[PDB]
Each structure stands twice: as C-alpha cells, then as structure tokens.
Amino acid sequence: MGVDPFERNKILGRGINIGNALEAPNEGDWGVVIKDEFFDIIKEAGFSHVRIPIRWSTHAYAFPPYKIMDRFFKRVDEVINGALKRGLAVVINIHHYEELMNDPEEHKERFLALWKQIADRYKDYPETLFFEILNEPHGNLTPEKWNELLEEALKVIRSIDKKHTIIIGTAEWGGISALEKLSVPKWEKNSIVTIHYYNPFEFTHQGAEWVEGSEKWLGRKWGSPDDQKHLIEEFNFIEEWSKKNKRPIYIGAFGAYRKADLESRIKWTSFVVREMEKRRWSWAYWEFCSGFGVYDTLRKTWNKDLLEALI
Numbered sequence: 001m002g003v004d005p006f007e008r009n010k011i012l013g014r015g016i017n018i019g020n021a022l023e024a025p026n027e028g029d030w031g032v033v034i035k036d037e038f039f040d041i042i043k044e045a046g047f048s049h050v051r052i053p054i055r056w057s058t059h060a061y062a063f064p065p066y067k068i069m070d071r072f073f074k075r076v077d078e079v080i081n082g083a084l085k086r087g088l089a090v091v092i093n094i095h096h097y098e099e100l101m102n103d104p105e106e107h108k109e110r111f112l113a114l115w116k117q118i119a120d121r122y123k124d125y126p127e128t129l130f131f132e133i134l135n136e137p138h139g140n141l142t143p144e145k146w147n148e149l150l151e152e153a154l155k156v157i158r159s160i161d162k163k164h165t166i167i168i169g170t171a172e173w174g175g176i177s178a179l180e181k182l183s184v185p186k187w188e189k190n191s192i193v194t195i196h197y198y199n200p201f202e203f204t205h206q207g208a209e210w211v212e213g214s215e216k217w218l219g220r221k222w223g224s225p226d227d228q229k230h231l232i233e234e235f236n237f238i239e240e241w242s243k244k245n246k247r248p249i250y251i252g253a254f255g256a257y258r259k260a261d262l263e264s265r266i267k268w269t270s271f272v273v274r275e276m277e278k279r280r281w282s283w284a285y286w287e288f289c290s291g292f293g294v295y296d297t298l299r300k301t302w303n304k305d306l307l308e309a310l311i
C-alpha cells in the first residue's frame with residue numbers, strides 16, 4: 001500500500017524537468033543527454049525531484065507483446081537510479097506517443113502493454129518514484145476517450161503495483177482547458193492530478209520553432225498588473241477544482257522560451273512559482289538546460305536570476 005497523495009505531493013515539492021532528452025526519437029537528438037552529474041547539480045540547488053520525459057514508444061516493438069527494447073530499458077534504469085542516489089524523488093512518464101494521440105483505438109493495447117512492463121519493472125523501487133500515465137493527451141485522444149483510457153491504465157498499473165503514486169494529466173494538451181472534463185475513478189485514492197501551465201501561450205511560446213505561427217509573437221512582454229491578475233484568476237480556478245474533487249495538484253511543466261525578453265521570463269517565472277506555492281502545489285520547471293533552460297551545462301553555471309525565481 002501507498003501514501004496519502006497529498007503526502008506524496010509534498011514529497012515531490014519543487015522539481016525540474018530534464019527535457020529535450022529521452023523524449024526525442026533518440027537521446028541527444030534534441031540537444032540533451034542526461035549526465036549523472038546533473039543529479040548532484042539539481043539536488044544541490046535545492047530541488048526535491050526531477051521529471052523525466054521518456055518516449056518509450058520508439059523503443060518498443062510495434063507488434064505483440066510490444067516488448068520494450070533491452071538497451072533502452074537499462075538506460076532508463078540508470079537515469080532513475082542516478083536520481084534516487086541523490087535523494088531526489090522521480091517522475092517518469094510516457095511522452096510523445098504520437099500514434100496513440102492520432103489513433104488511440106489502434107494503440108490502446110500497446111500503450112497498456114508498455115505500462116504493464118514499466119510497472120513490472122519498477123514495482124519494487126522506492127516510494128519516491130512516481131508513474132505519470134501519459135504526457136499531454138490530445139488530438140483524437142479526446143477528453144472523453146482519455147477518461148476511459150486513463151481508467152484502463154490505472155487498472156493495469158494497480159494490478160501490479162499498489163505502492164506508487166500515479167500522476168494523471170488533462171486532455172486537450174494538458175492545460176486548464178479540459179480540466180473540468182477530467183474524471184478520475186472514485187476507487188483510486190493514490191493519485192495526483194497534473195496540469196502544464198504556459199499561459200499566456202503566445203508569451204511563453206513566442207518564436208518557438210515547433211509551433212505554427214509563433215513568429216507572430218516575438219517581442220511580446222509579460223508583467224503588467226493585469227497579466228498578474230489574469231494568471232491569479234486561472235490559478236484560482238485550478239485550486240477550486242482541486243478543492244472540489246479532492247485531488248492534489250502538480251504543475252508538471254511550466255516555463256518561458258529563451259526568445260522572450262529575459263526580464264519578462266524572470267518576472268513570469270518568479271511570479272508563477274510564488275502563486276503555485278501559495279496554493280501548496282508541487283511543480284516542475286520546463287526545463288533544465290535546453291531552450292527553456294536555467295542551467296548552462298557548458299559553463300556549468302545557473303542563470304542565477306532565473307534560479308532565484310524558482311528557488
């Protein structure tokens with residue numbers, strides 16, 4: 001048996017995503033390779049956990065039993081244990097499984113087979129390891145289809161592991177837009193709800209090369225009293241949903257891209273953290289050392305003003 005999800009949310013506390021790493025097609029393709037020293041660096045700065053985006057789908061066969069490939073599995077073990085060695089808690093997920101988003105019907109059983117294998121693999125790992133069902137469900141994996149798939153995933157996971165806390169995200173890309181449509185089974189009592197926060201999207205994502213039409217936002221600033229008032233109102237809505245449904249909240253990803261002016265990024269980041277903490281939510285900054293990075297792996301220095309904002 002596990003622990004009260006609010007206790008495990010407290011255990012998560014402040015975290016950071018190590019992104020553009022294991023969620024790319026191959027680790028290193030998007031610019032980051034998880035170095036073991038990264039865990040000393042993150043723990044020493046004061047973080048309580050790390051979130052590790054993992055694209056298991058490109059490292060598992062496409063035909064039954066959809067076995068995850070040996071070498072990749074060993075690599076993930078090395079990352080998880082590297083973080084556990086420093087006393088960091090760890091969130092692992094299934095990230096960028098695009099076929100599942102485009103054709104959930106056809107990939108439902110493969111997705112559940114991946115969780116069967118991941119849960120089997122780590123069922124005896126420490127209680128500070130968290131299982132995040134699926135990053136940003138979207139597209140044809142509609143709010144309605146997600147509520148059904150997540151319940152199926154929970155059944156699969158819980159059939160093997162009654163100890164680890166599970167993290168459940170929202171549909172429509174995992175933000176607040178489909179939160180009110182999310183439904184977590186009453187029988188599950190060991191889960192945390194996660195939401196990604198990048199609002200205002202045009203500000204956080206301005207110039208993002210992977211977002212169509214983002215060039216039209218370059219230069220946009222953030223920081224007026226109305227900007228602050230609007231963020232607060234959105235957080236208030238999340239808080240109330242949490243209160244109503246009785247589920248802890250984890251803001252699993254939030255951050256502003258390097259193209260936005262530094263001062264607005266710092267202002268936006270420092271402000272989001274202050275407002276999440278007031279609400280006692282756990283969270284993970286997006287991300288450690290890449291395009292939204294706070295740590296420069298070459299110089300081995302942190303962007304001190306941005307770190308200060310995260311603390």
Ligand SMILES: OC[C@H]1O[C@@H](O[C@H]2[C@H](O)[C@@H](O)[C@@H](O)O[C@@H]2CO)[C@H](O)[C@@H](O)[C@@H]1O
Binds near residue numbers: 020030135136196291
């Ligand atoms: O899709 C590729 C891009 O991903 C970007 O990170 C995403 C992350 O995968 C999402 O889950 C969510 O958190 O938003 C992030 C930022 O849009 C990544 O930063 C880019 O470099 C990738 O090209």
Ligand SMILES: OC[C@H]1O[C@@H](O)[C@H](O)[C@@H](O)[C@@H]1O
Binds near residue numbers: 173210211212
């Ligand atoms: O709202 C749509 C956007 O959601 C973001 O979380 C993704 O990173 C973008 O790729 C996507 O275009």
